[PDB]
Every structure is written in structure tokens, then in C-alpha cells.
Amino acid sequence: MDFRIGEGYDVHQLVPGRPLIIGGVTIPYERGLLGHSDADVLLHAITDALFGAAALGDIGRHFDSRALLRECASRVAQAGFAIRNVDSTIIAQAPKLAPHIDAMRANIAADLDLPLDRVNVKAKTNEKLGYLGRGEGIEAEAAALVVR
Amino acid sequence: MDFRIGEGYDVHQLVPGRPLIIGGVTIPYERGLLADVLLHAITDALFGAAALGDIGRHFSDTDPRFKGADSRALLRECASRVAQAGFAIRNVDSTIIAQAPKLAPHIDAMRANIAADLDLPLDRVNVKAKTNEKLGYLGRGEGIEAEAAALVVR
Amino acid sequence: MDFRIGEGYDVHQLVPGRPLIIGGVTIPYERGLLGHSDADVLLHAITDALFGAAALGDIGRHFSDDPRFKGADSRALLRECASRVAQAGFAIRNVDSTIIAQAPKLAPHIDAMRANIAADLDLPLDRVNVKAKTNEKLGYLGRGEGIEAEAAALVVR
Ligand SMILES: [Zn+2]
Ligand SMILES: [Zn+2]
Ligand SMILES: [Zn+2]
């Protein structure tokens, strides 16, 4: 009954010459996300939500973004926590994300050793507003529930 | 003891020539949303907690089953789907971010609409109001955002 | 087993001539956050998440941007928030949060922020978390026009 919640945020710029990788899925696109890692904004947001729920700090303190997510899960477990569920949203004007959501969920559940029914990924546009609306970047946000 | 959490986001442009409807409430104002940003966010948080995908998967602008549906009917159908999936709703919290108009006078009405649609006691539904301190498109009154969190249990 | 969750958001402009106070920490810097109170964006977001979890409205309902709160210490506001949440019958189980800022560097101050929040909520450190982010050079955040914070809280009645 010792439940905890975590919340995470990430954003990266969309630039020429990078592959677009979100939720571990390589999505055909003219630009990709800019970062030191592969810049997987969704996995990063979920990673931060998991560190937050476990009160283990953040991705900046601790560190392929799937390997990092798998290591995050290891650290959460090390602290005595079990992951109960993850929910998330990706915000991008383009490209279309719906065809790729199922693969992302499958990847996240594998990396977190969760059944598919405890993992969720939602897709949003930003209604043409802000840097998101202009296609300058992609945001992700996440929530995680854990228990010790 | 099988609890789950969900989170939701929505945003729309604020322009003259549309009514302003938030949380099922029509608010007198010179501009409107181009589109109930609060109900959408809550709807998405509930689907998320149940791991049922999102509002786009359930209620396609394509689908004829829901053409013209009010954001409240969609919220009600969301809740029915959440229950059949085996989940009971424990609470909802949310924030509306808008530079104008003032939203405090309307909060109890929004809470009442949401609690009704989700068949929840009023004290398990919360709506919070923020400005964006004149920063960004929110700050310029070009759009309004909402965010939501939901706790459920199977 | 009567758990509830809350979520919070805040933002303030970054301006010359103001103290920069985040998570109760006074951070040396040429600019500070603008607000009616001390404009502690992180404590405000956490305060809203707590009121939200307890279904008690928001920081605007409880602490109106009244001369009673000009210059107000946002740690005193957070403690009063916690007092009201407890009066409503709720116990706090944990808090998580994120600060998004182009500058200054926040990592050196995070542990102090966590300690302040934990003291104010009468929680052990291992139930309080503060994460620091940049906005990867995007938007008004990327231009340093303001600082955002967001929070999540779990409580139980
Ligand atoms: Zn990232
Ligand atoms: Zn919407
Ligand atoms: Zn504030």
C-alpha cells in the first residue's frame, strides 16, 4: 500500500540529418530529434516519471534510450519499487503518430517488464500553436505509478 | 489495490467568432476556442489510466457514430468504457491555463458538470485556473490549454 | 486505501531587480521571478497539486494574488496548504516535480529544494523529488523570459 506517483516532461528540437525515433520506433520523416543520446523524447519523459515516483532524482543526474529506460527500471527496482502502470502523451504537429503507437507501447512494456495493459501512449497535435505547432520540436509527457 | 494513473493534455486557438466553452460551461467573451479543452484533457487522462489508448482512437472525427457529439457525451461514453474494462474512478484533478477571461466564477459549474458525467461525488473532482503570466501564445490570448490527472482502480 | 492524485503548473516571468527564489532557495542571479508573492514557481506548482489532490480548489482560491500576500514567503503558503489538506482529512504520501529553465544552473540547488519541501510537508526526503530541465532552447523558456514548474502529488484520506 506504499504507492507513489511520478511525472515527467521532455522536449527536443526537430532537425535535418537525424532519424526520428520515438518510443523506440524509427518513424520515416525528413527530420529527427536532436540530443546527446538518440533523443527519444517519449522514453526520456517516461524515464523521468519513473525516477520521480521512486524519488531517485532525474535523467540528468543518472546519465540508446531503450537501454537507458531499462537501466532506469533496474534502479527503480533496486530501491524496492514495482512499477504498476505508465501513461504518456506525445505532442507533435507532424508526422502522424497513430500508426506507430502500438509498436511504442510494445517496446515500453518489454523494457519495463510490464504487460501491455499497464502501458499507454497517446498522441496529440498542438493545434498549430507555438514552436510545437510550427514543427520546431516534439514534446512528451508521462505519469507513472509505483509501489514499494 | 490495483490502482492506475492517467494524464491528459489539450490545447485550442482563441479567436473571435466562436463561443467559449470550457468544462461544459459557456463563458461570455469576445473570443472562443477553434473544442472543450478541459473535458478533452480529462477524457484523455481517463483512457490513459485504463490503458485504452486515447480520445483520437475512440472518437474519430472520421467516425459517424460520434459526428456532432458534445464533449460531455464523449466524456460519458469514455467513463462507460472505463467501467466495462473493469475500472472505477477515484478522482480527477485539472488545470486550465488562460490569460483571459477570469475563470474562478465558473469553476463550481465545471466541477458539477464533470462530476455528473463521471457519476462521481463532487469532492472527487477538482478544476484549477491559471494565467500564463503574459508569456507565450497562452500569455497573448492566442489559445487556452488544459491538463488533467486521473486515478482509477480495478 | 482512499488515494487521490493532484497535478500542478506554474510559470513566472524572469526580470531584473527581483530575488530568484525556487523551492525556497535564494539563488544568486541577476534576475528573479516576478509575482505578487516571492513568486516561487516550484512551491506554487506543488501547492496547487496538493490542493488539487484534496479537491480544495487552487492556490488562487486560498491565497489570492490581497496585500496580505505581497512579498509572502511561499514556504509559509505551502505549510498552510498542507495544514488545510490535513484538516480536510488527507495525509500526503509523495510529491514529484520538475523545474524548466534555460538559466541559471539548478542542479547545485536541487537537494536544498528537496529538503525545504520535505521539511514544509513533514515528509522524509525519500518521499520528495525535484527534477531540473532545460527546454532544449525552445520557446520563451528557451529565450529565458520565464521559468516553469510542474508537480504531482499523491495523498490518502
Ligand atoms: Zn530528452
Ligand atoms: Zn481538444
Ligand atoms: Zn506562482
UniProtKB/Swiss-Prot annotation, chain B:
GO BP, sorted A to Z: isopentenyl diphosphate biosynthetic process, methylerythritol 4-phosphate pathway; terpenoid biosynthetic process
Residues holding 4-CDP-2-C-methyl-D-erythritol 2-phosphate: D10, V11, H12, D54, I55, G56, F59, S60, D61, T62, D63, R140
Residues the entry annotates as binding a divalent metal cation: D10, H12, H40
Gene3D superfamilies: 2-C-methyl-D-erythritol 2,4-cyclodiphosphate synthase (3.30.1330.50)
Key words of the record: Isoprene biosynthesis, Lyase, Metal-binding
Domain of life (superkingdom): Bacteria
InterPro entries named among the record's database cross-references: MECDP_synthase, MECDP_synthase_CS, MECDP_synthase_sf
HAMAP family: IspF
Protein role: Involved in the biosynthesis of isopentenyl diphosphate (IPP) and dimethylallyl diphosphate (DMAPP), two major building blocks of isoprenoid compounds. Catalyzes the conversion of 4-diphosphocytidyl-2-C-methyl-D-erythritol 2-phosphate (CDP-ME2P) to 2-C-methyl-D-erythritol 2,4-cyclodiphosphate (ME-CPP) with a corresponding release of cytidine 5-monophosphate (CMP).
Listed name of the protein: 2-C-methyl-D-erythritol 2,4-cyclodiphosphate synthase
Species in which this protein is naturally found: Burkholderia pseudomallei (strain 1106a)
